């Protein structure tokens, strides 16, 4: 069931994640499969890299400590979780992608420089 | 330089027979290939038999078939032919000759057979 | 009887110029090369062309020689008294698988 | 509230990807399509879905159309080039036995060719047909000696159709519509997720759809536009119309050699009687049909309108007759036995073959099609229609004209889609750092 | 020791070289074969990877989760697979099993994943 | 209660196939092709406590390399000038100038008329050839391969010498190798050892004797997949080399001829000095030696008063019925009747015979024309083992008849690769332990 | 800036470890040379990401480890190290000791995993 | 005690050799790289870092000059081979209206051409320059007949420059030189990183250097060794100088079937007056470019030094004369007028028109550019010199992949290496 969740609320869609995640990573043709390949690799590094940043590495669920800014949307928690998909979330705040990522980054690089001087002490 | 041809022949009776041999020296026997030639007192030269340097290819004229066999040692650089059911028309003096393809090139001697009562 | 033929005799000529020549077939002569033999009485042949035109070693300028069609001669410069022998042509033929002669030509200088 | 990301969120985007071959349980799509599929289809429905739709810039068709063209292309690769033909033919009539319907059709060709040596030549003859020969000005030539080289087809490969199943690499997946009734665009409420698509044949045909998939209930019409008169409309019957197929004669091939280790293959004698190929059409049958899609037409034309069909307007046989491979022989058919009839027992449509193909329209290359020994007959499935438009009455014709429709008439359900797995939503977390 | 030298040792003696074979991972017609070669090294390292990251197993060569040990699996006696034993044998043993304990292993770590979501909410 | 534990890094493995890349130690193709600088330091790691399965007979590693080493090959003939022009017809006779008995009707002069530079002009060419090259009309002849196959020179740049090559495992593989001495080729292997490439084997072909292989580390191995069934071969590998000393005594000339814009053929030309048969020479009383060795083993699976024979192949074909040599650059078919002419209970000199066309690899559409290689050749190589045969059996009789039966090219190189297997590593697995994840 | 903390000093140049990381890992022949430029770029992304990992340090920038600082490697002090001058000063001052270093970490990690093991069992 | 850091993102390089790939803005140049650029692309400026280049083993040109003969067999390989034409030709003089210097320049040949069928042969003409045809005793054959395959170009394949961007793959980086008056050598006390080159046009030419960029301020020398007479000098100049050139006549393409859709191009009759090929360099301005190239060469040489220019040796066209591909064109151009002065208005350069091209240095292929139709007029900019010594200056020319590193000198290929360690004072 790799979609089944499509049509859930973004809550219960949450509860199966690695239904996604195992599906990922599973002579002019040789050119095309090897192009296939690759590149269904290059997809798979590039999020888990950018997990790896955040400080997100090895989970589904990643719990930061950055807030959330009402003006990337102001919807209301039980507007958000339930009665709506993630298709439609995705949609709502595409806009905001691109900062709130930058954001999670500049967390993830202040946390680690206060463990470094703690473990100082 | 020389065969020697070692005069193996001699008087014999019709439907007897004679071993005529040959030697080598200033020759690396093992190496050439060898023939017979035969002259009949008065006449021109004909060729009785071949043998190759290996000893595997043997050819003989017409008139000596099945009576003659040529043979070759090449560890004592020697070479004979045994003579079987001689006839009176076989008088001849017999030649022992090195041979290259398609001519004669080292004779010597020669050795008398004669054939009669 | 011989597998090719020649003249019994070259007897015509002194004054440095005979010729002496043989003749076959397409089964010896046309197909394959010739060679020439000198000998004088009492003693085994001598080797003086073979190959058609080459000089045996310790042959002089006085002997030559030539091939066509199925045919073949023996050009003479010397004859001098000491040019006195019979003379004969052979070769190798395919149909007997042997290296055969002619008669033999007696050549004696006038 | 707090930014917390997830990894493994069901969201899509549409994308354009390059999707693999894969096989049912000497044949070039057999060999293409190593990938067996598995026997099982996901077939996931996803509930409260709904997808947009539009079969007219679906992609999965182009690559469809480039693969065949590339598989063709690389099947003849290696196959001998009949350059040696290409030489002054003395030609005049086959008369042994011609019925009077093949008179002129057929003719009989000698001519001096080449041989392993090429110090020799040979008188050869062979058989021809009037389609693959003009006249010098008894001089004749091949059709394309001045145009493109030939390639003999290898006659032991084979180009008869295998369903294909396309399918997305990992990454990727494709969408179904489920939705009966769907018309080519727009949303589409019910739809499932599949990671191979249904098996296509890669039939190739003119003006009439062969061998295809039928509608679920009822004939169903489907256009790019429908009102302008440029775009094609495309008619999928829920039923299919049996035609069968002839090449009724007796034919023997013989090999020449050309050169060393290349042989030509040409058409020998005709044993027997020598007739006219034809395709029989059930009338019954196809009347029936016309009449479910006059039905159908009407509700863009309206109840007082008169639907009239008609034959094609001329041009190239490639365009103007109905056309198919099949037995390995190239039928061209006259097919205006089949639209005659103004809408307020067998129908026989006569054919010809041709053996020197333009296959894909193009200008360097042509390929010439070996004969076939024997006699040939083929039955098949007549599933729809490609036809072209143009007061109180309006005129179809079984106009054809594009390679790519023969395709797209099979992928109106699918659509790729890119699946990506990150995403970020507020909730009441925060990290304890 | 080597990259295979472990292999004749008991399973507990043989968990101290697990660096030693993981480090050897992942170390125009053939342009076609070897990059065949290559990117399937690369695929098969990361799908191994992959299956760790779900377990919550990401970063450890040992890794110890709450998944109960069925002795339907096996009942040997754990002195018996720890030590007069090798991974050869231990792994055609419990190979009817590896679908079972793989797929138990998932549904753990996606509860666990959802208990510290909850607490640190709290 | 015990819990599950995942470890990753577990030194385990599974039988698989995988293709391999070869590395090695010039216009050669080995050199150019095994371009990959072979391991400095091949170290070897014993396994100890590791018992393995070894099969010979299904073992891929010998099928990856038949199948690039013709790759190899075609890819080396490819860009090379196609003799087309040449198949003509030609008016030949027969060299006559220094021939020796043997050697009668052998070579061929023959004459035809090839293009120049210009296509507008023809000129008149002769060369040799090999009686096996050329077939008659009906003084008309024709190159043998005209009515069935392209003919392609080789280019006389590009070299086919043998150099030892190493097959290496590409990174997630690992070939184990046995050390086992006297092992069969089937079945257990009890002491093992893994390594990363395997040790240089020249990529020889023959057709009877095995030449330029390992030795055996005792005593004279005998192989085969059934042994019993006489339709299987016999491999049989020797402890002990047999120095043979081959030859093509002869002085070749090699003529380059225009045959059209940059395309050159090469012909043969006059020789110069007598013309030769070609031989090997093996020592006698080493054959002698060897062979009653072979037999001593033999008995093991046939009977200690049976009789054993050897005897001559049964007849066709050249490619298989005489030991086919290819050395110096020329293609020899040497008769080896001489070898196997003995009942168990100084020189032999083999004469062999030269042909220029050949269809090496078993295929119809392509022949490959060797150029002469100018001057005398001169060739010294090792038997290292044989092919054999089996003629019936010893059932109803209490003899038996063995033949240098040859034929299958493989044979030559599953004999140094029964050695090896090629294995896949798994790391990841678990296994119960006395402890909690703690959450 | 991509290089731009490459003139900073050590410890200034660490305020931005993620600038240079996420600008890593970013049909004729010309197929075969672009393959194996992309082939390269994951293979040297992944081997990194082992190596990490094998020491314990998968998912962080900066990861303090327990193996003590060998002064033989340098004796240079904390002054000295992580101000007035530059990485890539440094890394040739120790360019000599990399792989003993790592031969460290990794053995440190080995030893971690099996206490952590060894607890989580009491 | 200290303990061990790791550090992951540590902004470090070595010194690097890879495969950059093609990237630009039916033209061969932009079907090989089909990779849009300059979307107002990035250059960080690095601050305190001093890097060492070396021009003379820079590896970017080398892919350069690698790329380049690869694109070009790719461009012939499909196209007509004229083998049915290497025939016996009879050939006279063209004589309808010749300007004394073209006479016995331009050939009109005939010959039997193969008709679509190959039983029929046909009567064609056409008319060659003297340098593709060659005498066999008026029987004439073509120059490569007895060497190589001809292969005529496709006339619809533009080989025309078009700027190209080299790029770094990920995980490399290319740093450029900013270093005003870098002499090719050594450190760089002032350098940048970029994703891409800037724009090269892959021009090729011998003895002068043309389309290139120029010197940011006065004429620079570059040279591998300076002092060895045995290398060549690169000059670059700080201005351009202009140069006109001309094929003044008025073509005809015929096209002539060789086979079945094979077809030869042909050059036909000619409209108008025939006449010679050449270059207008402005005088006055080809004076004083030379001035500040001898006012430079002079730092090396002295200033009591007497430099003198000079003409080529001699031996083939190919090294001899300047060789300009352009409107489709080959042309060789004496250039001798531009090398004679001692150093204590227009001028004009003959030059001539060859068809068979040995393009690269090879021996088994050539290549036969169709003819231009009508009239070609080119406009170019000479930015620089390749001179040898012996002071004796001359246009010595020789090698093309100079063309190109006087333009990729100011950059390099690094690869970053993201991993490191450090002592600090925090303990796991
Ligand atoms: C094989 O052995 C033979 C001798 O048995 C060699 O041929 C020549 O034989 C004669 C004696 O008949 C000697 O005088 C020569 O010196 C031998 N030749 C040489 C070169 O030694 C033959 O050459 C040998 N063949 C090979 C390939 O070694
Ligand atoms: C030769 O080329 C012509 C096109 O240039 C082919 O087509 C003919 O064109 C003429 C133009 O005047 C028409 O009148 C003919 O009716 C066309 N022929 C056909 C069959 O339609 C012609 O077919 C080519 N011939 C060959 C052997 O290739
Ligand atoms: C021509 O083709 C034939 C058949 O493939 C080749 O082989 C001959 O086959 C006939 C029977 O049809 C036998 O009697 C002959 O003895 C075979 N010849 C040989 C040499 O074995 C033949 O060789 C081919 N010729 C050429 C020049 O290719
Ligand atoms: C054919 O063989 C003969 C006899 O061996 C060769 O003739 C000898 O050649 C050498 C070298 O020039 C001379 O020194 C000898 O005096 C010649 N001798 C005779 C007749 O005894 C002849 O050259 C050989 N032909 C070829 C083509 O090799
Ligand atoms: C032509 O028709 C007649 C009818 O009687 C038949 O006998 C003959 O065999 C036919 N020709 C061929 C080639 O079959
Ligand atoms: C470069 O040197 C200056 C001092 O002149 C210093 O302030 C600056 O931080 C150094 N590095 C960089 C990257 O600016
Ligand atoms: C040759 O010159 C004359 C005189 O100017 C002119 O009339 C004639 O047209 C010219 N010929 C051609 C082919 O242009």
């Known amino acids: 069931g790799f979609l089944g969740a499509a049509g859930s609320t973004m809550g219960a869609a949450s509860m199966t994640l690695t239904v996604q995640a195992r599906n990922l990573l599973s002579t002019v043709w040789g050119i095309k499969q090897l192009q296939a390949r690759v590149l269904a690799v290059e997809r798979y590094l590039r999020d888990q890299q950018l997990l790896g ?69 | 330089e020389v065969q020697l041809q070692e005069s193996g022949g001699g008087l014999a009776q019709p439907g007897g027979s004679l071993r005529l041999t040959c ?70 003096v017999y030649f022992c000759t090195r041979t290259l393809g398609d001519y004669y090139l080292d004779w010597g001697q020669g050795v008398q057979v004669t054939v009669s009562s | 009887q011989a597998g090719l033929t020649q ?53 002089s300028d006085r002997f030559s020689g030539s091939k066509s069609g199925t045919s073949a001669s023996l050009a003479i410069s010397g004859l001098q008294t000491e040019d006195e022998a019979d003379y004969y042509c052979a070769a190798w033929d395919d149909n007997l698988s042997g290296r055969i002669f002619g008669g033999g030509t007696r050549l004696t200088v006038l | 509230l707090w930014v ?13 990807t390059t999707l693999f071959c894969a096989s049912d349980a000497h044949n070039v799509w057999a060999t293409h399509c190593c990938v067996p599929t598995d026997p099982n289809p996901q077939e996931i429905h996803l509930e409260n879905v709904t997808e947009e739709f539009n079969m007219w810039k679906n992609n999965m068709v182009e690559q469809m159309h480039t693969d065949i063209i590339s598989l063709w292309d690389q099947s003849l690769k290696p196959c001998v080039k009949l350059t040696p033909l290409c030489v002054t033919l003395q030609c005049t009539n086959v008369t042994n036995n ?52 030939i390639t003999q087809a290898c006659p032991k490969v084979s180009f008869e159709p295998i369903p294909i199943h396309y399918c997305a690499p990992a990454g990727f997946a494709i969408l179904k519509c489920k939705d009966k009734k769907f018309n080519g665009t727009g949303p589409c409420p019910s739809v499932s997720t599949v990671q191979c698509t249904h098996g296509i044949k890669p039939v190739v045909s003119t003006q009439l759809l062969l061998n295809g998939s039928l509608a679920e209930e009822e004939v169903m019409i489907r256009s790019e536009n429908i009102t302008n008169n440029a775009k094609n409309i495309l008619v999928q019957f829920n039923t299919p119309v049996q035609i069968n197929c002839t090449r009724p004669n007796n034919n023997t091939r013989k ?108 200008i360097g290359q042509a390929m010439y099609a070996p004969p076939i020994q024997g006699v040939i007959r083929c039955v098949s499935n007549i599933t729809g229609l490609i036809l072209t438009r143009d007061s109180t009455t309006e005129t179809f014709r079984p106009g054809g004209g594009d390679m790519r429709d023969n ?27």
Not at chain 1, 94 to 119: A, H, P, V
Not at chain 4, 101 to 109: A, F, P, Q, T, V
Not at chain 4, 110 to 123: V, W
Request: charged share 20%; aromatic share 10%; net charge positive.
């Open chain 1, 53 to 121: 940043i955040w400080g997100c590495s090895g989970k589904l669920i990643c719990c930061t400590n950055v807030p959330w800014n009402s003006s990337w949307s102001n919807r209301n928690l039980s507007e958000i979780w339930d009665n709506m998909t993630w298709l439609q979330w995705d949609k709502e705040i595409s806009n905001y992608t691109q900062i709130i990522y930058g954001l999670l980054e500049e967390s993830q690089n202040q946390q680690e420089k206060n463990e470094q001087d703690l473990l100082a002490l």
């Open chain 2, 23 to 92: 030697e080598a020296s200033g020759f690396t026997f093992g190496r050439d290939d060898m023939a017979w030639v035969r002259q009949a007192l008065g006449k021109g030269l004909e060729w009785v038999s071949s043998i190759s340097n290996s000893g595997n290819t043997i050819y003989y004229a017409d008139p000596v078939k099945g009576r003659f066999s040529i043979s070759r040692d090449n560890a004592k650089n020697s070479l004979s032919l045994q003579m079987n059911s001689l006839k009176i028309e076989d008088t001849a």
């Open chain 3, 7 to 59: 003249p019994p005799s070259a007897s015509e000529a002194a004054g440095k110029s005979v010729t002496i020549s043989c003749s076959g077939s397409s089964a010896n002569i046309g197909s394959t090369s010739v060679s020439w033999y000198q000998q004088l009485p009492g003693t085994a042949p001598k080797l003086l062309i073979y190959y058609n035109d080459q000089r045996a070693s310790g042959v």
């Open chain 4, 4 to 16: 917390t990301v997830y990894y493994g969120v069901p969201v899509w985007k549409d994308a354009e």
């Open chain 4, 98 to 149: 011609i019925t009077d319907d093949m008179r002129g059709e057929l003719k009989n060709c000698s001519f001096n060719m080449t041989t392993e040596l090429r110090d020799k030549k040979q008188k050869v003859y062979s058989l021809f047909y009037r389609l693959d020969v003009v006249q010098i000005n008894k001089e004749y030539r091949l059709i394309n000696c001045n145009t493109s080289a």
């Open chain 4, 255 to 362: 090999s020449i050699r050309i050169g060393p280790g290349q042989w030509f293959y040409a058409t020998g004698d005709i044993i027997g009687d020598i007739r006219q190929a034809h395709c029989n059409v059930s009338k019954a049958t196809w009347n029936e049909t016309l009449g479910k899609v006059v039905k159908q037409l009407r509700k863009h034309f309206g109840n007082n309108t008169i639907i009239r069909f008609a034959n094609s307007s001329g041009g190239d046989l490639e365009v103007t007759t109905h056309s198919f491979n099949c037995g390995g022989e190239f039928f061209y058919c006259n097919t205006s036995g089949l639209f005659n009839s103004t809408w307020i027992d067998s129908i026989t449509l006569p054919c010809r073959i041709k053996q020197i193909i333009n296959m894909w329209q193009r």
């Open chain 4, 407 to 433: 395709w797209r008439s099979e992928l109106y359900k699918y659509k790729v889609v890119k699946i990506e797995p990150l995403g970020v939503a507020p909730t009441r977390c925060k990290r304890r750092v």
